[PDB]
Amino acid sequence: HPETLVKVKDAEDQLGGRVGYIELDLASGKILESFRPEERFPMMSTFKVLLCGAVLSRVDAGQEQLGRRIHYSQNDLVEYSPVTEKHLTDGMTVGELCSAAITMSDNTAANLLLTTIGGPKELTAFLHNMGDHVTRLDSWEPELNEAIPNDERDTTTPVAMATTLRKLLTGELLTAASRQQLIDWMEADKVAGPLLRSALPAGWFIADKSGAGERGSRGIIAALGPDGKPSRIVVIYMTGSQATMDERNRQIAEIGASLIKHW
Ligand SMILES: [Ca+2]
């Protein structure tokens, strides 16, 4: 039952392309283990957590309200909008849109939220303005989903993403209420069952967000730990192969099993 780094390397052997991995201690931020920590990978829908971090930062600044209701039209709807397509008459609140973006990966929700802050370059500026000079969003949905890398638009690195996620979930960049709101949305993720959650023992906490894309791309960002309390950040990305979805999923689940068994 392989050690985590051994399993990550084996996943890469099996899949082709690259697999990147990092594990951070949540309390201290120290890197516990890594593979390809500074190499770029497509974020895919993992960006939607960062987007809601930016929205919450605006809430904390008095520039946005989670209860603000956004109406939109049929023409706004893009691929993979399972929540927003149901609310053409009533619209959705900003907070509902973040729940849809994170928990269901809803693409129209993400686009609507990106509009509230001025687009992908403004999300990049938010990241830069928190000290992440690596991660960048360039595209809207579903173009992000539809894209082949190209290989620097819409990328992060395992360490930049992990670092950034820790800064959103801990410390004081966001208020206590906003850090808790963000982790709640991630805890409520509905579409990442095949990944880390498949390996998760009973009684553990997990808050996560997955992604998938063309050229064998798959990823997950998570805060997890035993006894109902997160205590580590894990980030896993893969890209650059011909792997099927079932194959990508199985490898992420097996990395997950190794990290749990060696915790
Ligand atoms: Ca290799």
CA distance 118 to 157: 24
**b/e for 158-179, b at 16 or more Cβ within 10 A?**
bbbbbbbbbbbbbeebbeeebb
Distance 117 CA to ligand 1 centre (A): 39
Give residues preceding each break in the chain, C–N over 2.5 A: none
For residues 148 and 24, what is the distance between their CA atoms, to the nearest angstrom? Answer: 29
Q: Classify the phi-psi angles of 191: left when phi > 0, otherwise alpha if psi is within -120 to 50, otherwise beta.
A: alpha
Å from CA of 9 to ligand 1 middle = 6
Q: Helices 176-187 and 94-103: crossing angle, nearest 10°?
A: 40
Report, as residue numbers or ranges, the catalytic residues. 45, 143
Task: State which residues form the domain around 232.
Answer: 1-263
Quote the tokens at residue 15: 């899949």
Query: What gap in Å lies between CA 189 and CA 174, rounded to an integer?
Result: 21
We report the CATH number of the domain holding residue 100 as 3.40.710.10
Q: What CA–CA distances, in Å, run from 38 to 19, 133, 134, 221, 229? A: 12, 12, 9, 16, 28
Give 172-193 as a DSSP string: TSS-HHHHHHHHHHHHT-SS-T
* CA dihedral (143, 148, 150, 155) positive or negative: positive
Q: How far is the CA of 5 from the centre of ligand 1 (A)?
A: 11
Q: For residues 47 and 123, what is the distance between their CA atoms, to the nearest angstrom?
A: 9
Omega within 30 of 0 (cis) for the link into 142: yes
12 annotated to a ligand binding site: yes
Distance CA 173, CA 167 (A): 7
Amino acid at site 51: L
For the chain, the domain total comes to: 1
This PDB structure is determined at a resolution in Å of: 1.0
Q: What is the spatial distance between Cα 22 and Cα 158, in angstroms, rounded to a whole number? A: 6
Experimental technique used to determine this entry: X-ray
